[PDB]
Amino acid sequence: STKESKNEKLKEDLEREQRWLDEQQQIMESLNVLHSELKNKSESRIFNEL
């Protein structure tokens, strides 16, 4: 009985960890793209703007 309960909990945790890993991969990719875009890209100009 204890082994059955352990297996059920293991499967549930596996599913949850897979979803979390997918979301974290997405977040990391977006953050890396944003950092690359930011890295890719004097009172006279301020006075001209005003």
Binding site: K3, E4, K6, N7, L10
Partner: protein
Amino acid sequence: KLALDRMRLSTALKKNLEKISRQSSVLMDNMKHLLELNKLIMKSQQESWD
């Protein structure tokens, strides 16, 4: 102490094997239940491993 007791039990059980096969006991029901449980336990163990 445990090793000596186990060896004594083993030889005493081997000496009377046929009596526990002809008209054996409810011990046969106990043995069939243990045999049914062990396989499921091992299968659950393998699943947990994976």
